[PDB]
Structure 1
């Protein structure tokens, strides 16, 4: 069965400006800008604050669609920590 409304929201810290333009998310911080297209997802992204929140919800979704809500949140969270702290992977030489 389809739930009427499944929603998940998240915080957006200051010094980071998030822009939503028809499922295109741009995140800008000290380290630069990051962009993710989400037009493949079928949800709606609403800032619902002074740019300090972001709520993503699906209407009449099945269990597969609501799985995308947490996926989208974590992807957008990745853009925030990418432009505030960056990412670093350490590889080791084994021989």
Structure 2
């Protein structure tokens, strides 16, 4: 193990609601609703106060990478529901 435990926290804005049903995370915002399943053995996702917490006991290198990836994905979903995404292409 690389550490005793790993805990990643993602803030929830005022207008956004995040719920967890087992291994599935649903984020509802002003601009829409998103749902995604983040599953990894030993990794638990919940909500505390105003943050989403991804937690694991005695993680390894791969476990830390997975936890950071899940946190990034949840942050992306929150950003998308709060303001959305735009891509530009040129002909």
The verdict on a shared fold, with TM-score over 0.5 as the criterion, is yes
Partner of 1:86: 84
Structure 2 unaligned runs (5+)? none
Structure 2 matches for 1:10-89, cutoff 5 A?
A: 10-39=10-39, 41-42=40-41, 43-49=43-49, 52-89=50-87
Q: CA RMSD in A?
A: 1.1
Give 3-state SS (helix, strand or coil) of 1:7's partner.
Answer: strand
Structure 1 unaligned runs (5+)? none
Q: TM-score, normalised by structure 2?
A: 0.91
Whole-Å separation in 1 of the counterparts to 2:54 and 2:23 = 11
1:2 Cα deviation from its structure 2 partner: 4.3
The structure that has the greater radius of gyration is 1
Q: TM-score, normalised by structure 1?
A: 0.87
Structure 1 ranges of 4+ moved more than 3 A: none
Whole-Å separation in 2 of the counterparts to 1:6 and 1:29 = 28
What is the CA deviation profile of residues 55-89 of structure 1, one whole-angstrom value per residue up to 9, with x for unaligned ones? 11111221111111110111001111111100000
